[PDB]
Amino acid sequence: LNIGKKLYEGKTKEVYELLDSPGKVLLQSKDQITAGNAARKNHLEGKAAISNKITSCIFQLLQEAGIKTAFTRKCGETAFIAPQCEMIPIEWVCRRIATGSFLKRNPGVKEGYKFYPPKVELFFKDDANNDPQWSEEQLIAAKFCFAGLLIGQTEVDIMSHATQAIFEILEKSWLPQNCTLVDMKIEFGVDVTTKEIVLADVIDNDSWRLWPSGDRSQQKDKQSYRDLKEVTPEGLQMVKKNFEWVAERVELLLKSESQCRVVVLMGSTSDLGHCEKIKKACGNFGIPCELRVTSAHKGPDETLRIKAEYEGDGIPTVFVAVAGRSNGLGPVMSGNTAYPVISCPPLTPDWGVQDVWSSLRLPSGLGCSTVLSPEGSAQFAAQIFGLSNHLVWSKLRASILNTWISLKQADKKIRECNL
Amino acid sequence: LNIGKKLYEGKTKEVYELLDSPGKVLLQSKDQITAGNAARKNHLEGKAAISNKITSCIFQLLQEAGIKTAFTRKCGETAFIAPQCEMIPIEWVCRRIATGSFLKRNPGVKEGYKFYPPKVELFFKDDANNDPQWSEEQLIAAKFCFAGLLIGQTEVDIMSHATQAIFEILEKSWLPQNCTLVDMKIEFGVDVTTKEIVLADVIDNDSWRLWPSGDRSQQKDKQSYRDLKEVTPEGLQMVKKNFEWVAERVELLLKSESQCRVVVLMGSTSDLGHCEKIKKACGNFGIPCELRVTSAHKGPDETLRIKAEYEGDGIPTVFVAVAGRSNGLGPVMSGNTAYPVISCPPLTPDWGVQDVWSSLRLPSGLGCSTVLSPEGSAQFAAQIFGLSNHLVWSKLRASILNTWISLKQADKKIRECNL
Ligand SMILES: Nc1ncnc2c1ncn2[C@@H]1O[C@H](COP(=O)(O)OP(=O)(O)NP(=O)(O)O)[C@@H](O)[C@H]1O
Ligand SMILES: Nc1ncnc2c1ncn2[C@@H]1O[C@H](COP(=O)(O)OP(=O)(O)NP(=O)(O)O)[C@@H](O)[C@H]1O
Ligand SMILES: Nc1c(C(=O)N[C@@H](CC(=O)O)C(=O)O)ncn1[C@@H]1O[C@H](COP(=O)(O)O)[C@@H](O)[C@H]1O
Ligand SMILES: Nc1c(C(=O)N[C@@H](CC(=O)O)C(=O)O)ncn1[C@@H]1O[C@H](COP(=O)(O)O)[C@@H](O)[C@H]1O
Ligand SMILES: [Mg+2]
Ligand SMILES: [Mg+2]
Ligand SMILES: [Mg+2]
Ligand SMILES: [Mg+2]
Numbered sequence: 048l049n050i051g052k053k054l055y056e057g058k059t060k061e062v063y064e065l066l067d068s069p070g071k072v073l074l075q076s077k078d079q080i081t082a083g084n085a086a087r088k089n090h091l092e093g094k095a096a097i098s099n100k101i102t103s104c105i106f107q108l109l110q111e112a113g114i115k116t117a118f119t120r121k122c123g124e125t126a127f128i129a130p131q132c133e134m135i136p137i138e139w140v141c142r143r144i145a146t147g148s149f150l151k152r153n154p155g156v157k158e159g160y161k162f163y164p165p166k167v168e169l170f171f172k173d174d175a176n177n178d179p180q181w182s183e184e185q186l187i188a189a190k191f192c193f194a195g196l197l198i199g200q201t202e203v204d205i206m207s208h209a210t211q212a213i214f215e216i217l218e219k220s221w222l223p224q225n226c227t228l229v230d231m232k233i234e235f236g237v238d239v240t241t242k243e244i245v246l247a248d249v250i251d252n253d254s255w256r257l258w259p260s261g262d263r264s265q266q267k268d269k270q271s272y273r274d275l276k277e278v279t280p281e282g283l284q285m286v287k288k289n290f291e292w293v294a295e296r297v298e299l300l301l302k303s304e305s306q307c308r309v310v311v312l313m314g315s316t317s318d319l320g321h322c323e324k325i326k327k328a329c330g331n332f333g334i335p336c337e338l339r340v341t342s343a344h345k346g347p348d349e350t351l352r353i354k355a356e357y358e359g360d361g362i363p364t365v366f367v368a369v370a371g372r373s374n375g376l377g378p379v380m381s382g383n384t385a386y387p388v389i390s391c392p393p394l395t396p397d398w399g400v401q402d403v404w405s406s407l408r409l410p411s412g413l414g415c416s417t418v419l420s421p422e423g424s425a426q427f428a429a430q431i432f433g434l435s436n437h438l439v440w441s442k443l444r445a446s447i448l449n450t451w452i453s454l455k456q457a458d459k460k461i462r463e464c465n466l
Numbered sequence: 467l468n469i470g471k472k473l474y475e476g477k478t479k480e481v482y483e484l485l486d487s488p489g490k491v492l493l494q495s496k497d498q499i500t501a502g503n504a505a506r507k508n509h510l511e512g513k514a515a516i517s518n519k520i521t522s523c524i525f526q527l528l529q530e531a532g533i534k535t536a537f538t539r540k541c542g543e544t545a546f547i548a549p550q551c552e553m554i555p556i557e558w559v560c561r562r563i564a565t566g567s568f569l570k571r572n573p574g575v576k577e578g579y580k581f582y583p584p585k586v587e588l589f590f591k592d593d594a595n596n597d598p599q600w601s602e603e604q605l606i607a608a609k610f611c612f613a614g615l616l617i618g619q620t621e622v623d624i625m626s627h628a629t630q631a632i633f634e635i636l637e638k639s640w641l642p643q644n645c646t647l648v649d650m651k652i653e654f655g656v657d658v659t660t661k662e663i664v665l666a667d668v669i670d671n672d673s674w675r676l677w678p679s680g681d682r683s684q685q686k687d688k689q690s691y692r693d694l695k696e697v698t699p700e701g702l703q704m705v706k707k708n709f710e711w712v713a714e715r716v717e718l719l720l721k722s723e724s725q726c727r728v729v730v731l732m733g734s735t736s737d738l739g740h741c742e743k744i745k746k747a748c749g750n751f752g753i754p755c756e757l758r759v760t761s762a763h764k765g766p767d768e769t770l771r772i773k774a775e776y777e778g779d780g781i782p783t784v785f786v787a788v789a790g791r792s793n794g795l796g797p798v799m800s801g802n803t804a805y806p807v808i809s810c811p812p813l814t815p816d817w818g819v820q821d822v823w824s825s826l827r828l829p830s831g832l833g834c835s836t837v838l839s840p841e842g843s844a845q846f847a848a849q850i851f852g853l854s855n856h857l858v859w860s861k862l863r864a865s866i867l868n869t870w871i872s873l874k875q876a877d878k879k880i881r882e883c884n885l
Pocket of ligand 7: 557589597
């Protein structure tokens with residue numbers, strides 16, 4: 048590992064150039080904890096390893112969901128490799144629950160006020176003035192430029208939407224551990240190579256407020272250190288145990304709590320191309336997808352036996368029925384399983400207007416749903432599993448963001464061809 | 467006129483009970499101008515008449531548009547009758563252009579920054595603390611109750627949307643006088659009889675910032691008095707002339723700058739019911755609407771002569787063609803006039819799926835549009851005239867608000883039937 052010059056150093060991290068890696072840097076954590084802009088600073092042994100472990104797990108989680116993130120890989124106990132960014136000097140905060148500075152700036156609001164949707168705020172980075180709140184209008188008027196990207200209305204709107212999405216993903220991911228994510232702070236930078244705005248810096252135990260069972264008095268985050276009247280050695284051991292508590296649970300956010308499976312049943316091997324599109328699209332949400340050939344019309348006995356194989360092994364299953372012309376496979380399956388059935392018929396413009404009604408108009412006592420897009424039927428199957436699986440949910444959530452970002456970028460492009 | 471007790475008195479107005487009018491009060495203006503929470507106060511002769519005249523014109527304008535407003539009628543030179551309200555102690559501000567307190571609270575924003583859409587802000591009324599900015603969260607948490615109405619999320623969302631709509635109407639109404647409405651402040655109350663939230667207090671020359679030709683140095687509003695280093699008698703005569711300038715122009719906001727007409731051409735007197743619905747709906751936007759009987763099929767010579775009558779008298783006209791079955795009246799009219807033509811065919815479920823295509827699929831060189839709803843065709847005709855007529859525009863704008871308010875009220879009702 049070919050380490051170059053120390054680029055900068057701050058309160059908790061040293062950033063080094065990597066001579067064998069163009070556009071990449073090494074972020075080495077220090078055994079330092081800090082708070083405020085006064086003398087609250089301490090050595091804390093093992094903090095560097097805890098910060099590194101949390102950020103490395105959280106960045107891998109957000110990256111596997113599809114959030115664009117400045118993270119390459121973990122590099123031992125106390126560092127990580129990242130794409131080099133020109134950091135935007137704004138703290139982006141997201142709140143589910145009103146506490147901390149929100150109450151000070153909004154006297155009359157009580158602790159516990161819930162934000163639907165989560166509240167996003169901006170703070171300009173400046174220790175001299177204790178990080179003052181900025182409006183979107185102030186950030187636009189600053190006309191900041193980083194690695195050649197002017198930070199305008201489009202870029203601010205993107206960081207704002209991304210902050211909400213990142214919060215919701217981390218919020219949903221902590222829920223299975225019976226922890227309430229109250230709020231968080233993140234920072235973005237411009238990747239010096241790609242010129243993309245990406246989540247950067249770290250997300251660690253100083254970034255958020257984490258309340259087991261929603262109970263503030265059980266707070267496990269750095270607020271436990273900020274709240275101390277006086278820092279004693281007995282006080283720092285409590286803080287360290289809180290950081291250890293989070294370090295011991297954070298890797299479980301990468302694990303699937305519940306199993307998911309899509310079974311695509313096709314009446315004919317001529318509709319294989321259409322079923323390959325469903326299977327591929329399921330792969331994008333990390334949901335295993337099996338293809339099976341069975342006809343309701345010509346082998347209804349075999350359809351029910353295949354159904355029984357998937358009903359009988361304890362794995363939650365969504366069936367997707369692909370039947371051309373008069374669809375009996377969706378209906379028959381729908382009538383004989385408690386699991387959901389989606390008809391995704393391979394309609395063409397020739398007879399599709401006529402064929403679709405055999406999926407849509409069903410006798411009473413049948414729940415069978417219809418989705419015409421094959422990518423759509425995978426997404427709907429994912430949305431169903433997202434109710435139980437935070438990993439699938441997070442891919443859906445990040446995909447809503449990324450698609451929205453794509454529209455903003457295409458509008459920005461075509462707007463330049465308006466002069 | 468049976469005047470009762472003086473209910474309250476402030477810096478500029480005395481409010482009196484009316485013994486012959488239940489739930490109504492008389493707001494008598496005083497010849498006083500004021501600014502800030504210090505000694506800036508002055509007698510100004512004729513100010514009471516100028517304030518009364520402006521508020522009376524502005525309230526009549528907003529009321530004729532369809533904005534719910536605490537105004538009954540003008541009552542001589544210096545008073546007006548209003549429904550009595552329990553006033554909500556919030557100043558609602560709307561901004562098109564960043565100036566004044568927006569720049570102080572957002573250092574870095576330059577004078578002239580434009581808000582798309584117009585920015586709404588709240589200020590809590592308290593002279594002791596110079597009227598501090600409140601968040602929507604602070605107003606909700608105050609749990610204010612006025613004439614029995616709890617001010618909750620629904621009520622705050624309504625005042626916020628109403629503030630934007632009122633600003634946009636006044637903004638559009640000043641445009642024909644080549645005046646830029648920069649920003650404004652309004653207050654709402656609860657009508658003690660109806661229990662509706664309504665625009666109340668006044669809107670006068672102290673309520674807004676008015677720049678002729680967009681030029682701040684020509685400001686005609688009360689900012690001209692606020693800006694004086696020292697108040698001299700020569701200084702007050704300039705302020706008075708600015709107030710007179712606005713008083714002399716404000717009545718022109720009630721006058722139509724451009725004439726509007728809808729001509730509904732029907733192929734058959736059996737479609738008269740359908741044409742009566744278009745005419746009634748046109749009446750709601752204040753647009754005269756004539757009915758005429760002509761067939762393209764059986765009297766095309768007469769169709770063209772009737773067309774010529776309306777093309778030839780210099781009144782801007784939208785033609786609405788009502789033809790059952792094979793619509794030739796829309797197309798023929800569309801091909802022979804430069805004025806817009808709307809086909810509004812009287813479709814029923816029997817043959818409407820078949821008949822509609824004769825309105826929709828036209829030879830090249832025909833602009834003829836289709837609107838199936840008869841109320842819809844009137845609204846579309848209004849939207850066309852709204853590009854030229856601020857009065858029509860304002861009815862459309864207020865109708866978007868009122869419809870949105872209706873949805874919030876129906877959601878609030880059905881939500882109570884969710885327990
Ligand atoms: N991917 C990245 N590329 C380049 N610089 C980065 C990246 N991630 C973080 N940094 C910077 O690394 C520096 C050192 O981090 P740290 O020691 O935590 O600083 P700090 O004292 O918190 N300074 P600051 O964040 O500016 O208030 C920070 O100033 C970050 O801007
Ligand atoms: N329709 C109304 N019904 C009842 N009271 C009203 C109505 N419109 C205005 N008022 C009240 O009339 C009072 C007298 O007005 P004014 O003299 O302008 O007061 P002020 O000194 O500006 N006081 P304030 O608005 O409370 O800061 C105000 O306090 C308003 O709340
Ligand atoms: N961690 C930080 C910081 C921040 O600068 N923190 C450090 C400074 C440093 O990391 O070196 C500190 O002084 O404690 N700013 C916001 N937040 C987080 O943001 C949400 C809201 O915080 P609030 O604005 O209520 O204080 C909560 O989750 C904080 O942890
Ligand atoms: N007129 C007032 C008031 C207000 O309280 N005015 C008076 C008090 C009084 O009327 O007795 C004064 O002190 O001048 N607050 C906001 N505005 C209007 O609101 C927009 C924004 O004003 P900003 O917040 O920039 O000062 C601009 O159009 C003001 O005229
Ligand atoms: Mg901060
Ligand atoms: Mg930092
Ligand atoms: Mg004020
Ligand atoms: Mg007043």
